[PDB]
Design a protein around this ligand. Structure first.
Ligand code: CA
Ligand code: CA
Ligand code: CA
Ligand code: CA
Length: 294
DNA sequence: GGGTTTCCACTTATTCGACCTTTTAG
DNA sequence: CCTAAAAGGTCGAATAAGTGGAAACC
């Protein structure tokens, strides 16, 4: 069905990863082989998005990824030209853009077939050192060196509303909270919209307040890790801003159905049916089919 | 047919999503 | 007193990123 290219780039900001493998290989002339590419891993229920993306781009192979997940991997060298073209025209805007640029530099090394020389393998190692998690211990041991060039700090604005629809389809969440008290009904129904993201993109998440004209930021930490949530819990902002936004700029994948169910609940709250017993049980049943499982 | 690419099965680290209860604000 | 909104978390892998092994090329 062909995905809008900005929907795709938002989705990639939220679900894509680049990869640069530099593998010790006794069968290779320089003792190392490589593999360059881009991949997306989703729950099986979202296999269709990957099928559709594959068809849109015309590249990539789909395979299971463990018990409950499926992946679209693009590593065939010629096919990376499609990836490069797309992200040149519709650039990523999270810190993943830097990983993209690292990926582009490795592609050039290999385009010139330098990866078949030891000096080329060393270049890819330097490029890899700043990519994603960086070098393994093995590579750190075989190519000891000081990485001087620090990572480039991406600072780009939400380019348009479609990017944000694709982004939310990846890392967003539409949730029906059941706040149990002791009232006559003893359950307050609260719609929650949120987007989760690593602290490295706090500026982008922060901007969502101005961009959507509602919501707020929760900072979260656990040991050495830090992440951020853009959250909307105000019903009037759900009704007047959040819902209309995704009614026009469509979500993709199964989260679309979560949003639809979310909306059915929202209409029930707008009719004050969440305050009756019969509406509550309706809301309960709708919640049961949402998000995990479905 | 040797070196290199590309694929498919599966894992590791940890960034997400999804789920809770309480406190506070109207 | 009643209900909505926010605060303040927990849980666990649908996380983001990576790895082992080998078939398919040229
Ligand atoms: Ca993400
Ligand atoms: Ca993913
Ligand atoms: Ca996701
Ligand atoms: Ca729940």
């Amino acid at each position: 069905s062909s995905i809008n290219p900005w929907i795709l780039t938002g989705f990639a900001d939220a679900e894509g990863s680049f990869l640069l493998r530099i593998r010790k290989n006794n069968k290779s002339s320089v003792g190392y082989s490589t593999e360059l590419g881009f991949q997306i891993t989703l729950h099986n229920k979202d296999k269709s998005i990957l099928e559709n993306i594959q068809s849109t781009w015309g590249v990539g192979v789909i395979a299971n990824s463990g018990d409950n997940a499926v992946s679209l991997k693009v590593t065939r060298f010629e096919d990376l030209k499609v990836i490069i073209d797309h992200f040149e025209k519709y650039p990523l805007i999270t810190q993943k853009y830097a990983d993209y640029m690292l990926f582009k530099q490795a592609f050039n090394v290999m385009e010139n077939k330098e990866h078949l020389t030891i000096e080329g393998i060393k270049e890819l190692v330097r490029i890899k050192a700043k990519l994603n998690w960086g070098l393994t211990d093995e590579l750190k041991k075989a190519f000891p060196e000081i990485i001087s060039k620090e990572r480039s700090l991406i600072n780009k604005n939400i380019p348009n509303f479609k990017w944000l629809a694709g982004f939310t389809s990846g890392d967003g969440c539409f949730f029906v909270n059941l706040i149990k008290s002791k009232s006559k009904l003893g359950v307050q129904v609260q719609l929650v919209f949120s987007i989760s993201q690593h602290i490295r993109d706090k500026n982008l998440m922060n901007s969502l307040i101005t961009y959507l004209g509602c919501g707020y930021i929760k900072k979260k930490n656990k040991s050495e890790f830090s992440w951020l949530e853009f959250v909307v819990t105000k019903f009037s902002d759900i009704r007047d801003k959040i819902i209309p936004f995704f009614q026009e700029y469509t979500l993709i994948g199964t989260k679309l159905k979560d949003f639809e169910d979310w909306c059915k609940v929202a209409k029930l709250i707008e009719e004050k049916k969440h305050l009756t017993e019969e509406g509550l049980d309706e809301i309960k049943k709708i919640k049961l089919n949402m998000n995990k499982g479905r």
